[model samples]
Target chain A: GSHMPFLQTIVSVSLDDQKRANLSAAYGMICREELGKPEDFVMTAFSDKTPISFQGSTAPAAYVRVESWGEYAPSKPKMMTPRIAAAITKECGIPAERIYVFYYSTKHCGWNGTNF
Target chain B: GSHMPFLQTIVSVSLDDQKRANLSAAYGMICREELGKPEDFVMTAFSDKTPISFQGSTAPAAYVRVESWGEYAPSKPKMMTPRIAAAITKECGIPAERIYVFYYSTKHCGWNGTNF
Candidate 1:
């Protein structure tokens, strides 16, 4: 297990537990396969039924945030975003076009009562 | 209403509707009063019961992400983090030290089917 942590937060329309579980597993796979982080350090959170207005309308949409300790190739997210967006579409029926994904590196993060 | 979008996602152990509403209103107030953004543009999402491990433990903790258009002074978040953390503690019983806040400005954000 790596001390380097990777966290992904998915905020979208409402989803059932099965879908959330599917997404959690899928996202963990993305971190392991694409970002090379193990599942142990990967964290995924889902915020359902968020009132988001897109294109001036309140249609189905998603906003995703992916964060990690270090930097990776730009192509990593370029490849990962589509996969993530696709996964949401598959599980929750949100269109890929309506999804916004942001990736950033954190300078400081704390866990278990100390900064890591 | 301001087209500028301000979105915040709050992930913590668990919270009731009253606490979520309180935080939402408080955050909107922060945006309007502190950040000078109006409530119309502020958005807040809550992800409760998220499996988070902090300090090598899975105690009550929170991870907050604040996003908006344009840029603000570093002092803005400096002043905002503690207050936000304090609010979470008061409403949800999470310690201030166990909370993490990350703020960023979005370059390309889409709403109503268009990028802003």
Candidate 2:
């Protein structure tokens, strides 16, 4: 089974390459140091300039999804959301309040034209 | 609770503004027509050119996530993955096999400086 940990984030505001890289590194560290995932197997992605609305308003906000091949312990989201939100706040200037993190683990993931 | 249906995609290749809009519209249609979610509340996001590797190689792959506010029926993922992958292939040229689709529903989502 593939144990790869992947994190993908979508921010309504545009982010430059450097900010994206910084956030990716931050999440990579969280996966390795906090989530007990292999650093080398951690994958991060950023999507910026995505138009998102919150509270019936079009303001800067974010939706983040973190995934791995196996179930996360109940404490994992509690452990991860603050750090993840803080990193976005620090790096992208999107306040923690405007960010939503979603986490899940799956029995199947595709790669290289096949299921893993 | 907010029941917004949000779809976000991260592709290894860059997508132009027009392509992004087209794909967003495509997904909005899926949410409305196929998934039976309200079109007005459907949100679509595109993140392009973020780094990703599959099977130890990075050769144009994609990670797609679709979310709503409650539990999805077992049929939902099965109904969704093909159409989602087809749209990606049609709009972004990323082959369906090179794409991975993830689907989830959540109990909570934050918005406007607070959780909903």
- Listed in order, each prediction's TM-score against the native is 0.57, 0.58
Question: DockQ winner among the candidates?
Answer: 2
How would you encode candidate 2's per-residue C-alpha lDDT over B1-116 as one tens digit per residue? 22578887888899999899888888877777656656456778887886664434456778877777766665555666677788788887877656777666678876567764
Q: What are the lDDT scores of the predictions, listed in order?
A: 0.68, 0.74
TM-score of chain A of 2: 0.88
**Model 1 chain B worst lDDT run, 10 consecutive residues:** B1-10
Each model's fnat? 0.12, 0.25
**Candidate 2 Cα outliers beyond 4 Å, as residue runs:** B1-9, B15-60, B64-116
Q: What C-alpha lDDT does candidate 2 achieve relative to the native structure?
A: 0.74
lDDT of 1 by residue, A8-36 (tens): 54554777768767777777677677876
The candidate that achieves the highest TM-score relative to the unseen native structure: 2
Tens-digit per-residue lDDT, B1-116, candidate 1: 12353555455467889988999878777677667655456778787776554444456777777676666564565666667777788888888666776665656677779887
Compose the digit string of candidate 2's lDDT tens values, residues A1-116. 22557887888998876777678778877777667746445667766788999989778899998887667777767888999999999987888879999987875444433434
Ten-residue region with minimum lDDT total, candidate 2 chain B: B50-59
